[PDB]
Short mmCIF file of C-alpha atoms in Angstrom, two decimals:
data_model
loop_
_atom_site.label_atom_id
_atom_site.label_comp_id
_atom_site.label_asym_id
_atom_site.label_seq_id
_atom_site.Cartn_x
_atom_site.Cartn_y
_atom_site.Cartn_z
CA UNK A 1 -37.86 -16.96 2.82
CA UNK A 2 -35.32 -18.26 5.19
CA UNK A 3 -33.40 -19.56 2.21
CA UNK A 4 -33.12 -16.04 1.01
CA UNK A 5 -34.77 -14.80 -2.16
CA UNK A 6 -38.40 -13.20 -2.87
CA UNK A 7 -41.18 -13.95 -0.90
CA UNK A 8 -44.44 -14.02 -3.17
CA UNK A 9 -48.85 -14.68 -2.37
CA UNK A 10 -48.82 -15.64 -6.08
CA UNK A 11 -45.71 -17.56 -6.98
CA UNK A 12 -45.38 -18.80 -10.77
CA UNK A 13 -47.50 -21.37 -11.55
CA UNK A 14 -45.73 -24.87 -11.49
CA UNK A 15 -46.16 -26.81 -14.78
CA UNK A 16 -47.18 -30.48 -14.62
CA UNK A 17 -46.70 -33.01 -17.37
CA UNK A 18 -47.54 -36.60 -17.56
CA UNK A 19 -46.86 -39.19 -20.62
CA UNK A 20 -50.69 -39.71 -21.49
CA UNK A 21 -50.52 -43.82 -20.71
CA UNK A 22 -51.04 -45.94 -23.61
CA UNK A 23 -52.34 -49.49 -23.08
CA UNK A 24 -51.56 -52.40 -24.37
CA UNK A 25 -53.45 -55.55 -26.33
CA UNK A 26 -56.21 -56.02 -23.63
CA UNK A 27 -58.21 -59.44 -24.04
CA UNK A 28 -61.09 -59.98 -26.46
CA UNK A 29 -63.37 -61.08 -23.97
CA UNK A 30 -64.69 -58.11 -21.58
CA UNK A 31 -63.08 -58.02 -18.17
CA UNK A 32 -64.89 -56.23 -15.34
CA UNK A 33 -60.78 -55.03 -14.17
CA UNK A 34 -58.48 -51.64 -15.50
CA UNK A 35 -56.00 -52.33 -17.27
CA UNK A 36 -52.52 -53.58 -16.17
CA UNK A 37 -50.41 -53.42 -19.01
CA UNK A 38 -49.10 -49.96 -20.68
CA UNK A 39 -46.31 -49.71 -23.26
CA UNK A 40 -43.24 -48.83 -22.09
CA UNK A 41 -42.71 -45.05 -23.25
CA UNK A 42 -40.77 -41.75 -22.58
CA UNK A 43 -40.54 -38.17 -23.86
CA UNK A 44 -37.79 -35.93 -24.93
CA UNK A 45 -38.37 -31.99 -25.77
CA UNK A 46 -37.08 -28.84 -25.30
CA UNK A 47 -37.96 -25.97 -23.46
CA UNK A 48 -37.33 -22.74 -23.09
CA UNK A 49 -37.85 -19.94 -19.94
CA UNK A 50 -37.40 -16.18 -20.26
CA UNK A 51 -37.43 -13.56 -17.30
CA UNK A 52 -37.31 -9.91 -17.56
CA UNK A 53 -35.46 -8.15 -14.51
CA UNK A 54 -35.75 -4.71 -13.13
CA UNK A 55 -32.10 -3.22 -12.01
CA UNK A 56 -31.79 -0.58 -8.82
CA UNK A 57 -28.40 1.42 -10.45
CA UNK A 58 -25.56 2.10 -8.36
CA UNK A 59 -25.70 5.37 -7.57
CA UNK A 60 -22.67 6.42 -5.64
CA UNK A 61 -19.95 8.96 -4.44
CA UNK A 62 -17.79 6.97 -3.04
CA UNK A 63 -14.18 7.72 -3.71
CA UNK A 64 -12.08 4.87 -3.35
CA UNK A 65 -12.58 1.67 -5.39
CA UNK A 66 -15.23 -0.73 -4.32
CA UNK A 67 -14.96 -4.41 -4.00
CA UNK A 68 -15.51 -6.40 -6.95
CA UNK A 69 -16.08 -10.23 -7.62
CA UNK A 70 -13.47 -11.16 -9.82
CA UNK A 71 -11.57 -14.82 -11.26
CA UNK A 72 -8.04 -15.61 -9.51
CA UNK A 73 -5.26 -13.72 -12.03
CA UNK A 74 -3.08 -16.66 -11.07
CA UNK A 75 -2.98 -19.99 -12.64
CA UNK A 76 -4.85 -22.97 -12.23
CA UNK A 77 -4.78 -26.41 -13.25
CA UNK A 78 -7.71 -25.73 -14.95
CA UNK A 79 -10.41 -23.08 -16.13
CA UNK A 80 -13.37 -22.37 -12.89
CA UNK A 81 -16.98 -22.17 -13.93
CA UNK A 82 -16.28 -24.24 -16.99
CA UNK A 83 -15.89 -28.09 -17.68
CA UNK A 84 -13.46 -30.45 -16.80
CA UNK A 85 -11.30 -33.02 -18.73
CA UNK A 86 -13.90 -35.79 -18.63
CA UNK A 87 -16.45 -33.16 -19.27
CA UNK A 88 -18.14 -32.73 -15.93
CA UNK A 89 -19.24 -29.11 -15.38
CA UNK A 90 -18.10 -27.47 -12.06
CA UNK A 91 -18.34 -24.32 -10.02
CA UNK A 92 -16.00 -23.98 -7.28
CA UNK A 93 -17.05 -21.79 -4.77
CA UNK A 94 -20.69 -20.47 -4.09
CA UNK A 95 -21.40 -16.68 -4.91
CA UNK A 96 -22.34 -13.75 -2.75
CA UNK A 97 -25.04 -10.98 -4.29
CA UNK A 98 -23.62 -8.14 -2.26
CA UNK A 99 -19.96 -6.22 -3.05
CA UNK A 100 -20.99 -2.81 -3.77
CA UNK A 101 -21.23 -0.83 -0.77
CA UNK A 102 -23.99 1.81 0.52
CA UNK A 103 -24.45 4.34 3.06
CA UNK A 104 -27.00 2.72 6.19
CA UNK B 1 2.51 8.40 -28.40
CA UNK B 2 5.25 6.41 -26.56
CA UNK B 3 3.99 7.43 -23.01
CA UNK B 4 0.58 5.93 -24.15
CA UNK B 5 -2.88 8.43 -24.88
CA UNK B 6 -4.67 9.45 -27.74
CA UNK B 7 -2.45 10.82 -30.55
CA UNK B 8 -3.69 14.07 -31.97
CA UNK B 9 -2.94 17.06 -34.82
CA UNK B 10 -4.72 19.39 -33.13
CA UNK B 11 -4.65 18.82 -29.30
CA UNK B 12 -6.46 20.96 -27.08
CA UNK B 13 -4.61 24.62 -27.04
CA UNK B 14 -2.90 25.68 -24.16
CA UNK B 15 -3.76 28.50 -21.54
CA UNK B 16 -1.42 30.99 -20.41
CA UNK B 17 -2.32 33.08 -18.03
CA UNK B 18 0.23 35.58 -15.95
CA UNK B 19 -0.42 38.86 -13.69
CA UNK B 20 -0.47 41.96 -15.07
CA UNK B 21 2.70 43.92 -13.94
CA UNK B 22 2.38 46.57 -11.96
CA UNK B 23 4.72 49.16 -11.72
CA UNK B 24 5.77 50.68 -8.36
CA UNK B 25 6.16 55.01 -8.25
CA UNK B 26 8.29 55.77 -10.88
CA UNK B 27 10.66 59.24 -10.28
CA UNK B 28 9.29 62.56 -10.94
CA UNK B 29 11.88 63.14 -13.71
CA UNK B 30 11.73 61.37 -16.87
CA UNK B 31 13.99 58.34 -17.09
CA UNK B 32 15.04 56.24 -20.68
CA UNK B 33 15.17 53.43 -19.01
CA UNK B 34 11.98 50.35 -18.22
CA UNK B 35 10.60 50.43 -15.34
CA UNK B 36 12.71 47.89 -13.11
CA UNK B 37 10.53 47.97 -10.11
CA UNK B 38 6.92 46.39 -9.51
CA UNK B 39 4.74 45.35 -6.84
CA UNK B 40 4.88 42.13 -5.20
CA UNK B 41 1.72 40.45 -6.12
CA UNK B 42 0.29 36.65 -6.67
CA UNK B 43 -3.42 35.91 -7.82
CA UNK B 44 -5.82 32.66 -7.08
CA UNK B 45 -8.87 31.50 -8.34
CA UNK B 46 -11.56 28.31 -9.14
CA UNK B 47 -10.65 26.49 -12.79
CA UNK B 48 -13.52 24.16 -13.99
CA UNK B 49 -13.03 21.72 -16.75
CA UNK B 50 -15.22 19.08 -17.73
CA UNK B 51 -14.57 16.10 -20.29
CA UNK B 52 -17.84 14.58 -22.52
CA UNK B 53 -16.38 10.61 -22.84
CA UNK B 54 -17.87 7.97 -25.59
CA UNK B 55 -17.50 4.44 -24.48
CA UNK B 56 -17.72 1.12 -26.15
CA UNK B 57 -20.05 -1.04 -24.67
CA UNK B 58 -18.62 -4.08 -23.70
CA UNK B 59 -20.63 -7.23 -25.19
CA UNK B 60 -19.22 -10.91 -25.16
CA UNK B 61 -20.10 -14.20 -24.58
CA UNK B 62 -17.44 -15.65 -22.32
CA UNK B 63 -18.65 -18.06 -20.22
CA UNK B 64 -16.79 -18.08 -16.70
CA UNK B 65 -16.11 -14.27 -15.06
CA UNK B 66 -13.76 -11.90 -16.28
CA UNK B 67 -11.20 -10.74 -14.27
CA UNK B 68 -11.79 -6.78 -12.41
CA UNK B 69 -10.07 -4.38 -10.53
CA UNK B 70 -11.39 -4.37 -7.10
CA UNK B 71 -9.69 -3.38 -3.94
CA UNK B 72 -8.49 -5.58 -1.02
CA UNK B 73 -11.11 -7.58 1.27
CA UNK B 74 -8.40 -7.79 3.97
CA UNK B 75 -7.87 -5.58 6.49
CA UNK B 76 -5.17 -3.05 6.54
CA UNK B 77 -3.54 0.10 7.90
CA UNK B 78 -5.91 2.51 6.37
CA UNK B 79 -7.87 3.18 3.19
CA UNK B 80 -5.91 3.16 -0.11
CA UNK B 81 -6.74 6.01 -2.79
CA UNK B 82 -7.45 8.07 0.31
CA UNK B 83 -6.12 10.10 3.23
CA UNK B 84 -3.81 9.49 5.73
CA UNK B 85 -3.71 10.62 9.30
CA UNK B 86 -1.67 13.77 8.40
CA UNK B 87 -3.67 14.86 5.73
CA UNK B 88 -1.20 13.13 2.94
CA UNK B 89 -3.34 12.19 0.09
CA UNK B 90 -1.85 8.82 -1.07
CA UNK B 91 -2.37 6.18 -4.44
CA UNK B 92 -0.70 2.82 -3.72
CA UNK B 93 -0.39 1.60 -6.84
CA UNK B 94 -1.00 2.46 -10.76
CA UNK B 95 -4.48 1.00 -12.66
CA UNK B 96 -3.95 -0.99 -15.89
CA UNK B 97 -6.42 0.30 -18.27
CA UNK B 98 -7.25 -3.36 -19.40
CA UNK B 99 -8.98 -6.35 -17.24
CA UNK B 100 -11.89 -7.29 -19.74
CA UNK B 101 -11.25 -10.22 -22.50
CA UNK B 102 -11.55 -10.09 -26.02
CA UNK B 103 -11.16 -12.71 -28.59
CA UNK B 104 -8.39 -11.89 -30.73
#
C-alpha cells in the first residue's frame, strides 16, 4: 500500500452486523404496502480481537549504541500517551517503526 | 560493596602469573652468594574469558513508554563509544544501570 503496511490477495474478512428490524403494530386490515414503522432500537456488546505476530530478531554487531525510542526524561505538565485532566486520551507525536539500524 | 557490584565470600580467585627467571652465565668458581644477574626478558600472549549471565525478564504493565538509553539523533563530530581520527578509543559518558520502571 501507499499508506504503508502489508499488502494482501486475501485480506481478513470484514464483519457486518445489522440490528435485525423489528416492526411495529401494523393495521388489522391487510395492506398491499411494507411496513413503515420499526421500534426504535440499539445494541451494546463487547468484543474481542487477538493477533499472533512473527518477530525477525535483531541480530547485530554493531558496537556503539543504537538509537532507541524513548519518553522525554524532563518534565511535563502532564503524563504523554495517557489521559488528560478532563479525561480525554492523547498521543502527542506519531511513531516511526524503524530505529535499529542494519547493514544495506 | 560501596563502589556498587555483587558482594561475594568467595569471589573469583586471582591469577598470578610472572616469567620464569633466568639466570645469565654464572662464574666458573663456586660463589655463596644468589645469582644477581638474569636475562632481560618479557612474554605476551591471548587471555579468553567468558561470563554465563541470568537475567530477569522484564514484565509490566505500564501504559505510556519507558524511558531507554539510546544515543544522539543529531549530528556530531564523530561517533561516541568509538574511535577517533588518531586511533584514541574514547567513552563520552558513564551508563546508569537503571532506565526501566517498577512499581515500588
Amino acid at each position: 500500500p501507499l499508506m504503508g503496511g502489508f499488502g494482501l490477495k486475501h485480506p481478513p474478512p470484514q464483519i457486518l452486523i445489522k440490528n435485525t428490524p423489528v416492526p411495529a403494530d401494523p393495521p388489522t386490515t391487510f395492506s398491499q404496502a411494507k411496513l413503515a414503522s420499526f421500534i426504535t432500537q440499539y445494541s451494546t456488546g463487547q468484543v474481542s480481537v487477538e493477533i499472533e505476530w512473527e518477530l525477525q530478531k535483531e541480530n547485530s554487531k554493531r558496537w556503539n549504541p543504537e538509537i532507541q525510542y524513548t519518553s522525554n526524561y524532563y518534565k511535563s505538565t502532564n503524563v504523554d500517551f495517557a489521559v488528560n485532566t478532563e479525561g480525554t486520551y492523547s498521543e502527542p507525536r506519531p511513531i516511526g517503526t524503524r530505529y535499529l539500524t542494519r547493514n544495506l
